[PDB]
Amino acid sequence: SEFLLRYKLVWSETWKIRKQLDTPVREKDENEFLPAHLELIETPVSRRPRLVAYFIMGFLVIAVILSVL
């Protein structure tokens, strides 16, 4: 059961190094015109599906809050 503790230690120690190794932010055109592998590595998912998911979850939350008044 010592694998989990080592995983926790390394997780914490590299979480204290958070934002030091994160990729820089770029626009859509800058990301598109990269090498073939770098474009896929550095491209975030999108903004539209994230907005749809947030809207669905928020609608559920507001509905359940309004129903328990």
Partner 1 sequence: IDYGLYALEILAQYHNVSVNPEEIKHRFDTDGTGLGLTSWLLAAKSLELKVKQVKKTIDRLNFISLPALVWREDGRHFILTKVSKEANRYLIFDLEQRNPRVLEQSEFEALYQGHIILIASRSSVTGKLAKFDFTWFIPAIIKYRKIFIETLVVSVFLQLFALITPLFFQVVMDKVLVHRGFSTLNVITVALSVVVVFEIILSGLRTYIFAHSTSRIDVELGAKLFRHLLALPISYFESRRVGDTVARVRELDQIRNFLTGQALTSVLDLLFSFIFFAVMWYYSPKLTLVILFSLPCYAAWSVFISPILRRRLDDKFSRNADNQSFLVESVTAINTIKAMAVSPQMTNIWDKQLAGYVAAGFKVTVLATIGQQGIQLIQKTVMIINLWLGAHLVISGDLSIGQLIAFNMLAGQIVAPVIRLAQIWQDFQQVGISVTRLGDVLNSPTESYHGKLALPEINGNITFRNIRFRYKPDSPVILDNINLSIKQGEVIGIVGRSGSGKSTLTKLIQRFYIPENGQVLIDGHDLALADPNWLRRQVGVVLQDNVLLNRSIIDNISLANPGMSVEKVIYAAKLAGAHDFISELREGYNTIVGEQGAGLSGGQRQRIAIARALVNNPKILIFDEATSALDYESEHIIMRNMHKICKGRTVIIIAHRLSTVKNADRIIVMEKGKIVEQGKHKELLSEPESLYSYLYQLQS
Residues in contact with partner 1 by the rule CB under 8 A: 3, 7, 10-11, 14-15, 18, 21-24, 26-27, 29-30, 32-41, 44-45, 49-50, 52-53, 56-57, 59-60
23 alpha carbon, distance to own chain's centre: 12
Q: d(Cα 69, Cα 41) in Å, to the nearest integer?
A: 46
Q: How far is the CB of 11 from partner 1 (least distance, A)?
A: 5
Of the candidates 42, 47, 30, 15, the residue with the CA atom closest to the CA atom of residue 7: 15
Q: How far is the CB of 68 from partner 1 (least distance, A)?
A: 13
Give residues with Cβ within 8 angstroms of 39, minimum separation 6: 31, 32, 33
Q: How far is the CB of 36 from partner 1 (least distance, A)?
A: 4
37 or 69: CB nearest partner 1: 37
